[PDB]
Nucleic acid binder design. Structure first.
Ligand SMILES: Nc1ncnc2c1ncn2[C@@H]1O[C@H](C[C@@H](N)CC[C@H](N)C(=O)O)[C@@H](O)[C@H]1O
Length: 254
DNA sequence: TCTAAAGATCG
DNA sequence: ACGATCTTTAG
């Protein structure tokens, strides 16, 4: 069991056993919504193609892969007792938003992920990061996790683009896993129109003998979008009050 | 998930 | 120059 080095929304570490039970075998794995990378880090394919719409995240992954020793030594200097203070936090956030150097922006990005409020990621319409101070007791510097990420990445390529464009890179030796933002539980972001279009693209790939696996909440809407697949219920019963389970859908060819 | 200030849109 | 009703911002 291997851990990511970033805090992130909708991370899949606790569901890995159920995912690996139903995921097919092949030469190359494609992830159109990669995020913090928990599945990439806990599987064994010989090639990977990894993509996301967030451009600060993709640039950080390129620096860590190609300039490893230089990156670690510089980032370690920001994790000391002197920097756990509100007046210092708001000046570093300001330096980040004004800089135009990829290496310096990547160093500061990790500090903000581990000292900021509840570990969030949020921006305004101008592209400035605006999460406030978090006040933790003693944050942890993920050194071991950073070296292991660099090592596995020697066999992957990274891209900044949307889900229709990355899914079109697949060929007759590939396998695809999708993890989109969650569907709503009651009546800008990922739209209803977009949730349905994703299911349509999957039905077209499976005609070409290319297999696909998807995950989301178990509701009335998701059962309708994914009607042409085989469905498996995962009991979780998380409160809020009511219980909700999770769902997996598998498209397999003949 | 929350809320007091500031800016956007139409007749 | 006016006012009712929405969006947007950031602790
Ligand atoms: N149109 C889009 N195309 C591609 N990625 C998107 C799009 N919209 C949102 N995303 C990303 O989808 C990701 C959703 C995450 N929940 C995935 C978590 C990931 N499985 C992990 O283990 O960390 C986010 O990182 C988004 O930035």
């Amino acid at each position: 069991k291997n851990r990511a080095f970033l805090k992130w929304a909708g991370g899949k570490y606790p569901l890995l056993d159920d995912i690996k039970r139903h995921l097919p075998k092949g030469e190359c794995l494609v992830e159109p919504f990669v995020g913090a990378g928990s599945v990439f880090l806990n599987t064994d394919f010989s090639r990977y193609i990894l993509a996301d719409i967030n451009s600060d995240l993709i640039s950080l992954y390129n620096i860590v892969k190609m300039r490893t020793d230089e990156y670690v030594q510089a980032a370690r200097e920001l994790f000391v007792p002197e920097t756990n203070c509100a007046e210092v936090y708001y000046q570093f956030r300001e330096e980040f938003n004004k800089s135009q150097d990829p290496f310096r922006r990547a160093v500061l990005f990790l500090y903000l992920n581990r000292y900021g409020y509840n570990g969030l990621c949020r921006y305004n319409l101008r592209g400035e990061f605006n999460v406030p101070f978090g006040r933790y007791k003693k944050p942890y510097f993920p050194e071991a996790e950073l070296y292991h990420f660099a090592e596995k990445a020697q066999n992957a390529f990274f891209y900044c683009e949307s889900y229709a464009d990355s899914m079109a890179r697949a060929d007759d030796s590939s396998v695809v896993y999708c993890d989109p933002p969650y569907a709503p539980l009651s009546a800008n972001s990922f739209t209803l129109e977009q949730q349905a279009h994703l299911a349509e693209i999957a039905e077209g790939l499976v005609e070409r003998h290319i297999p696909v696996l998807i995950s989301n909440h178990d509701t009335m809407l998701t059962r309708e979008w994914y009607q042409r697949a085989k469905l498996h219920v995962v009991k979780v019963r998380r409160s809020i009050r009511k219980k909700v389970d999770e769902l997996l859908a598998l498209y397999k060819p003949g």
